[PDB]
Design an enzyme around this catalytic site. Structure first.
Site, short mmCIF file in Angstrom:
data_model
loop_
_atom_site.label_atom_id
_atom_site.label_comp_id
_atom_site.label_asym_id
_atom_site.label_seq_id
_atom_site.Cartn_x
_atom_site.Cartn_y
_atom_site.Cartn_z
N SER A 123 85.14 88.80 52.33
CA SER A 123 83.70 88.66 52.25
C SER A 123 82.92 89.30 53.40
O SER A 123 83.33 89.23 54.53
CB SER A 123 83.37 87.16 52.20
N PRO A 129 79.95 85.29 63.69
CA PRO A 129 80.62 83.98 63.76
C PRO A 129 79.75 82.77 63.47
O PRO A 129 80.25 81.68 63.05
CB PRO A 129 81.20 83.96 65.17
N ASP A 130 78.44 82.92 63.65
CA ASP A 130 77.57 81.76 63.36
C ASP A 130 77.03 81.79 61.91
O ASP A 130 76.20 80.95 61.54
CB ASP A 130 76.37 81.66 64.34
N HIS A 131 77.54 82.73 61.11
CA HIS A 131 77.16 82.90 59.70
C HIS A 131 77.17 81.58 58.93
O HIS A 131 78.07 80.76 59.08
CB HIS A 131 78.11 83.90 59.00
N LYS A 145 89.31 84.21 57.26
CA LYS A 145 89.64 85.38 56.42
C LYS A 145 89.72 86.60 57.29
O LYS A 145 90.55 87.52 57.06
CB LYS A 145 88.55 85.58 55.35
N1 LIG Z 1 80.93 83.30 47.88
C1 LIG Z 1 80.71 84.56 47.41
O1 LIG Z 1 79.78 84.93 46.64
C2 LIG Z 1 81.72 85.60 47.86
C3 LIG Z 1 81.22 86.83 48.46
C4 LIG Z 1 82.16 87.80 48.82
C5 LIG Z 1 83.52 87.63 48.65
N2 LIG Z 1 84.03 86.45 48.09
C6 LIG Z 1 85.46 86.31 47.98
O2 LIG Z 1 85.96 87.17 47.09
C7 LIG Z 1 87.06 86.56 46.35
C8 LIG Z 1 86.84 86.52 44.88
O3 LIG Z 1 85.95 85.41 44.52
P1 LIG Z 1 86.04 84.74 43.13
O4 LIG Z 1 84.98 83.69 42.96
O5 LIG Z 1 86.17 85.77 42.03
O6 LIG Z 1 87.32 83.91 43.19
P2 LIG Z 1 87.69 82.43 42.60
O7 LIG Z 1 87.76 82.79 41.22
O8 LIG Z 1 86.84 81.51 41.93
O9 LIG Z 1 89.17 82.09 42.93
C9 LIG Z 1 90.27 82.49 43.72
C10 LIG Z 1 90.99 81.50 42.89
O10 LIG Z 1 92.06 81.49 44.15
C11 LIG Z 1 93.21 80.51 43.98
N3 LIG Z 1 93.74 79.61 45.09
C12 LIG Z 1 93.06 78.75 46.04
N4 LIG Z 1 93.97 78.09 46.81
C13 LIG Z 1 95.20 78.48 46.38
C14 LIG Z 1 96.52 78.08 46.82
N5 LIG Z 1 96.69 77.16 47.80
N6 LIG Z 1 97.59 78.69 46.17
C15 LIG Z 1 97.34 79.61 45.15
N7 LIG Z 1 96.14 80.02 44.69
C16 LIG Z 1 95.10 79.42 45.34
C17 LIG Z 1 92.60 79.54 43.06
O11 LIG Z 1 93.48 78.88 42.17
P3 LIG Z 1 92.93 77.92 40.90
O12 LIG Z 1 93.12 78.64 39.55
O13 LIG Z 1 94.00 76.83 41.06
O14 LIG Z 1 91.46 77.60 41.20
C18 LIG Z 1 91.76 80.48 42.17
O15 LIG Z 1 92.63 81.27 41.44
C19 LIG Z 1 87.37 85.24 47.16
O16 LIG Z 1 88.37 85.44 48.15
C20 LIG Z 1 86.07 84.91 47.77
O17 LIG Z 1 86.31 84.16 48.99
C21 LIG Z 1 83.16 85.44 47.69
#
Ligand SMILES: NC(=O)c1ccc[n+]([C@@H]2O[C@H](COP(=O)([O-])OP(=O)(O)OC[C@H]3O[C@@H](n4cnc5c(N)ncnc54)[C@H](OP(=O)(O)O)[C@@H]3O)[C@@H](O)[C@H]2O)c1
Length: 243
Positions: A123, A129-131, A145
């Site tokens: 992401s 760091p204070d994000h 991450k």
């Molecule tokens: N917040 C944002 O808008 C944003 C912005 C930029 C980047 N991202 C990042 O980009 C990525 C994609 O996001 P996304 O929403 O498409 O993903 P997300 O679908 O909703 O899910 C990642 C999913 O990761 C798996 N997971 C979590 N803990 C696990 C563990 N202990 N062992 C195995 N699998 C595990 C989860 O398993 P389950 O099927 O069991 O849930 C699920 O498959 C993420 O890494 C996210 O942090 C997010």
């Protein structure tokens, strides 16, 4: 094999992870797809097929079978905060465990198997760091991450680190996908991107040697306000950052 790569996508039942799992074995015929999910419920969500393995990225031995024979790895796992509206991280499933250690375990497993390329989706936000995202559940996820990221850059295996902007659930293949460095895109208003274009960038990164050893932030422009990126050679080319 060198010419028909077995690609493991972890977090394959995830929202971005699942499209990555389909584009590996569908829109593509240049890969043998393999997926890793955390539960039996996740495996059914994506079809429940044979090429999907079940494991917990916090127990290295439970995920080792998934790495056997692979050539590339796309990590699409993340610690995921749960709400009791106030969110929290369940125990033993905090970003430190899931995102730092959980990824560390994937990256070690991959080196073992001789992976020629590890793609990780993270992401934007890590230069700060204070994000605000770090407070969500008291996790500091963005920092954790980054630790996994730096560890990936530190391992010796050719890597591609993709720091996405805010994720959107909108059609892929129809936007001006932007690529940057060091959170600079956060100054703009083009700091968000559809999940489907992230899934496409992971797949394309597999096809262009240019993506190797690169780290970039990924955003996009509204749809209709530009021609759909169809030429990824150029896209990766403008990236010279390694971290
Ligand atoms: N917040 C944002 O808008 C944003 C912005 C930029 C980047 N991202 C990042 O980009 C990525 C994609 O996001 P996304 O929403 O498409 O993903 P997300 O679908 O909703 O899910 C990642 C999913 O990761 C798996 N997971 C979590 N803990 C696990 C563990 N202990 N062992 C195995 N699998 C595990 C989860 O398993 P389950 O099927 O069991 O849930 C699920 O498959 C993420 O890494 C996210 O942090 C997010």
């Amino acid at each position: 094999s060198a010419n028909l790569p077995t690609v493991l996508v972890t977090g394959a039942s995830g929202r971005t992870g699942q499209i990555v799992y389909k584009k590996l074995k569908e829109g593509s015929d240049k890969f043998v797809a393999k997926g890793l999910v955390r539960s039996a419920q996740g495996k059914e969500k994506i079809g429940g097929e044979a090429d999907v393995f079940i494991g917990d990225i916090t127990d290295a031995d439970s995920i080792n079978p998934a790495f056997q024979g692979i050539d590339a790895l796309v990590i699409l796992t993340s610690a995921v905060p749960k709400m009791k509206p106030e969110f929290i991280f369940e125990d033993g499933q905090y970003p430190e465990q899931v995102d730092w250690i959980g990824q560390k375990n994937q990256i070690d497993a991959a080196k073992v198997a001789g992976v020629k390329h590890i793609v990780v989706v993270g992401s934007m936000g890590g230069t700060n760091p204070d994000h605000p995202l770090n407070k969500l559940g008291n996790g500091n996820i963005l920092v954790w991450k980054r630790k996994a990221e730096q560890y990936l850059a530190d391992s010796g295996t050719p890597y591609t680190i993709i720091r996405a902007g805010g994720l959107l659930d909108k059609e892929g293949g129809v936007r001006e996908l932007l690529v940057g460095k060091d959170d600079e895109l956060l100054q703009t208003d083009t700091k968000t991107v559809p999940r489907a274009d992230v899934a496409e960038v992971c797949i394309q990164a597999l096809l262009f040697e240019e993506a190797k050893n690169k780290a970039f932030d990924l955003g996009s422009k509204p749809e209709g306000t530009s021609t759909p990126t169809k030429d990824f050679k150029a896209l990766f080319s403008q990236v010279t950052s390694r971290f």
